[PDB]
Amino acid sequence: SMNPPPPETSNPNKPKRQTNQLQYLLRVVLKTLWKHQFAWPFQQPVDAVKLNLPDYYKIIKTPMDMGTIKKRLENNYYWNAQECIQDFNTMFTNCYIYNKPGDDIVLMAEALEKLFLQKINELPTEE
Ligand SMILES: COc1nc2c(Nc3ccccc3C(C)(C)C)c(C(=O)O)cnc2cc1-c1c(C)noc1C
């Protein structure tokens, strides 16, 4: 079985918090990206078996995807907004590292990242 286990989306020992910034990340940022027409390759872990990408998890050792991020937010997995922002950045970076510049999947990622940065520029202050 050559896919790794997916990133965890819950952990009984990891402290849980809700902040208005994490609420914004779920309700505005994730929602906007999730429903975007380019989102679908990013909505679940890369299935390197089904996609016939045998080298994927030889190259990418910190996988991340919006399905995992969405569940982490829904599960209050994150303590702060930076943890979630880091996961989005990891997802984009992995795409830019594994694929060739100018590939369609890279252009899709770049479009999602542009929207992402726009929404993060508008992050609300903590209540
Ligand atoms: C090419 O990069 C991906 N492609 C798919 C994918 N199929 C797809 C999508 C667009 C263009 C080309 C393809 C191939 C069929 C050639 C793989 C699918 C799918 O068809 O279900 C799902 N998830 C992906 C994640 C990724 C991906 C992401 C996201 N980051 O790195 C990789 C690799």
From Swiss-Prot:
There is a cross-link at residue 58 (Glycyl lysine isopeptide (Lys-Gly) (interchain with G-Cter in SUMO2)). The record marks 99 as: Acetylated histone binding. It is found in: Nucleus; Chromosome. Phosphorylation by CK2 disrupt the intramolecular binding between the bromo domain 2 and the NPS region and promotes binding between the NPS and the BID regions, leading to activate the protein and promote binding to acetylated histones. In absence of phosphorylation, BRD4 does not localize to p53/TP53 target gene promoters, phosphorylation promoting recruitment to p53/TP53 target promoters. Residues 17-123 form the Bromo domain. Ubiquitously expressed. Interacts with p53/TP53; the interaction is direct. Interacts (via CTD region) with CDK9 and CCNT1, acting as an associated component of P-TEFb complex. Interacts with RELA (when acetylated at 'Lys-310'). Interacts (via NET domain) with NSD3, CHD4, BICRA and ATAD5. The interaction with BICRA bridges BRD4 to the GBAF complex. Interacts (via NET domain) with JMJD6 (via JmjC and N-terminal domains); the interaction is stronger in presence of ssRNA and recruits JMJD6 on distal enhancers. Interacts with NSD3. Interacts with NIPBL. (Microbial infection) Interacts with bovine papillomavirus type 1 regulatory protein E2. This interactions may serve for the tethering of viral genomes to host mitotic chromosomes allowing successful partitioning of the viral genome during cell division. It is linked to Cornelia de Lange syndrome 6: A form of Cornelia de Lange syndrome, a clinically heterogeneous developmental disorder associated with malformations affecting multiple systems. It is characterized by facial dysmorphisms, abnormal hands and feet, growth delay, cognitive retardation, hirsutism, gastroesophageal dysfunction and cardiac, ophthalmologic and genitourinary anomalies. CDLS6 inheritance is autosomal dominant. A chromosomal aberration involving BRD4 is found in a rare, aggressive, and lethal carcinoma arising in midline organs of young people. Translocation t(15;19)(q14;p13) with NUTM1 which produces a BRD4-NUTM1 fusion protein. The NET domain mediates interaction with a number of chromatin proteins involved in transcription regulation (NSD3, JMJD6, CHD4, GLTSCR1 and ATAD5). The C-terminal (CTD) region mediates interaction and recruitment of CDK9 and CCNT1 subunits of the P-TEFb complex. It is also required for maintenance of higher-order chromatin structure. Belongs to the BET family. Chromatin reader protein that recognizes and binds acetylated histones and plays a key role in transmission of epigenetic memory across cell divisions and transcription regulation. Remains associated with acetylated chromatin throughout the entire cell cycle and provides epigenetic memory for postmitotic G1 gene transcription by preserving acetylated chromatin status and maintaining high-order chromatin structure. During interphase, plays a key role in regulating the transcription of signal-inducible genes by associating with the P-TEFb complex and recruiting it to promoters. JQ1, a thieno-triazolo-1,4-diazepine derivative, and I-BET, a benzodiazepine derivative, have been tested on tumors with success. Treatment with GSK1210151A (I-BET151, a I-BET derivative) has strong effets on mixed lineage leukemia and promotes myeloid differentiation and leukemia stem-cell depletion. This is Bromodomain-containing protein 4. The lineage of its organism: Eukaryota, Metazoa, Chordata, Craniata, Vertebrata. The gene is BRD4. The chain holds residues 44 to 168 of 1362 of the full protein.
